[PDB]
């Protein structure tokens, strides 16, 4: 019952890091290049520097952890191509070209049309599914977390802890007693979905973070996005029930959005409907032998 994912351990002067990209709670995102050695190509990747472990079990842990991220294989979710295995191990995935969701929908709320909203709302659903399929809680789905290889291929990314705060995205029971489950991951789904739909608004922006459970348990949610009819906002609503097992299953996500997805003009409701990252590759770098991870692989 064998598992023949290949982990490549490469070192690091096979790559170089132009830029950081960003940070969070396991260590630091760059923007670089791998250019394998005794060859003509430099292709675009990530890389993300993990914080020194803080005890023996835990580097171990770290190495349990890339095991699981080699055999995570599905177009919707990130793929690691390599590590390095450094004092401070870095994790290598190809790069998405677009950059974040979250950027892309706030730049171009101008020319974002509903089948693509909707499309976009199937391929985050069948990520998680597949992840939920591995017995995987994300934990942290958010718009800025889903990247975009192509206006109409998107990715999830920087999934959690294999084996175990954004607090404006947490499920309530995750808010109160740090549950988080598949269920409290569709309830982060559903916010996800409210920041497409709003072309990247914040939500509950103006209440405190402070404020948030008991609003929640006060039985108020996010407000109806203005190009959502009442049919997806519906769905919305659905993954943000009190009760965890009322919620939609990612499953029945993919299907209803699905259904949507062949009707756009029925469901969203948007006038003349009938990148920043991108364009800093084309500036910020040299780019005369750049290749995709598709081509070499
Ligand atoms: O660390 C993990 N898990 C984990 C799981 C998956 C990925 C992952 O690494 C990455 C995460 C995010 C990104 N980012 C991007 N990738 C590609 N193209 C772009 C373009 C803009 N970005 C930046 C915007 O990305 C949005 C997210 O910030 C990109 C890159 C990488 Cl390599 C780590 N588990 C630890 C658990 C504790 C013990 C140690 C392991």
Same mark, same amino acid.
């Given at each position: 019952?064998?598992?023949?994912?290949? !982990?490549?351990?490469?070192?690091?002067?096979?790559?170089?890091?132009?830029?950081?990209?960003?940070?969070?709670?396991?260590?630091?995102?760059?923007?670089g290049?791998?250019?394998?050695?005794?060859?003509?190509?430099?292709?675009?990747?990530?890389?993300?520097?993990?914080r020194?472990?803080?005890?023996?079990?835990?580097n171990?842990?770290?190495?349990? /952890?890339?095991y =699981?991220?080699?055999?995570?294989?599905?177009?919707?979710?990130?793929? !690691? !191509?390599?590590?390095?295995?450094?004092?401070?191990?870095? !994790?290598?995935?190809?790069?998405?070209?677009?950059?974040?969701l979250?950027?892309?929908?706030? /730049?171009?709320?101008?020319?974002?049309?509903?089948?693509?909203?909707?499309?976009?709302? %199937?391929?985050?659903?069948?990520?998680?599914?597949?992840?939920?399929?591995?017995?995987? =809680?994300?934990?942290?789905?958010?718009?800025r977390?889903?990247? %975009?290889?192509?206006?109409?291929h998107?990715?999830?990314?920087?999934?959690?802890?294999?084996?175990?705060?954004?607090?404006?995205?947490?499920?309530?029971?995750?808010?109160?007693?740090?549950?988080?489950?598949?269920?409290?991951?569709?309830?982060?789904?559903? %916010?996800? =979905?409210?920041?497409?739909?709003?072309?990247?608004?914040?939500?509950?922006?103006?209440?405190?973070?402070?404020?948030?459970?008991?609003?929640?348990?006060?039985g108020?949610?996010?407000?109806?996005?203005?190009?959502?009819?009442?049919?997806?906002?519906?769905?919305? %609503?659905?993954?943000?029930?009190?009760?965890?097992?009322?919620?939609?299953?990612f499953?029945?996500?993919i299907?209803?959005?699905?259904?949507?997805?062949?009707?756009?003009?029925?469901?969203? =409701?948007?006038?003349?409907?009938?990148?920043?990252?991108?364009?800093?590759?084309?500036?910020?770098?040299?780019?005369?032998?750049?290749?995709?991870?598709?081509?070499?692989?």
């Amino acid at each position: 019952a064998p598992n023949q994912a290949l !982990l490549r351990i490469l070192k690091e002067t096979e790559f170089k890091k132009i830029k950081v990209l960003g940070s969070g709670a396991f260590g630091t995102v760059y923007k670089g290049l791998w250019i394998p050695e005794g060859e003509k190509v430099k292709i675009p990747v990530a890389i993300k520097e993990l914080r020194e472990a803080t005890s023996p079990k835990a580097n171990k842990e770290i190495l349990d /952890e890339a095991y =699981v991220m080699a055999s995570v294989d599905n177009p919707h979710v990130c793929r !690691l !191509l390599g590590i390095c295995l450094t004092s401070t191990v870095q !994790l290598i995935m190809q790069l998405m070209p677009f950059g974040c969701l979250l950027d892309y929908v706030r /730049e171009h709320k101008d020319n974002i049309g509903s089948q693509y909203l909707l499309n976009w709302c %199937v391929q985050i659903a069948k990520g998680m599914n597949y992840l939920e399929d591995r017995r995987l =809680v994300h934990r942290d789905l958010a718009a800025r977390n889903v990247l %975009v290889k192509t206006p109409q291929h998107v990715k999830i990314t920087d999934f959690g802890r294999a084996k175990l705060v954004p607090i404006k995205w947490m499920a309530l029971e995750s808010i109160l007693h740090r549950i988080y489950t598949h269920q409290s991951d569709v309830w982060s789904y559903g %916010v996800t =979905v409210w920041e497409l739909m709003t072309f990247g608004s914040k939500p509950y922006d103006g209440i405190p973070a402070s404020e948030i459970s008991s609003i929640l348990e006060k039985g108020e949610r996010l407000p109806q996005p203005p190009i959502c009819t009442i049919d997806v906002y519906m769905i919305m %609503v659905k993954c943000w029930m009190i009760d965890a097992d009322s919620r939609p299953k990612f499953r029945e996500l993919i299907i209803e959005f699905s259904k949507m997805a062949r009707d756009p003009q029925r469901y969203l =409701v948007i006038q003349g409907d009938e990148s920043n990252f991108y364009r800093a590759l084309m500036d910020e770098e040299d780019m005369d032998d750049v290749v995709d991870a598709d081509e070499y692989l």
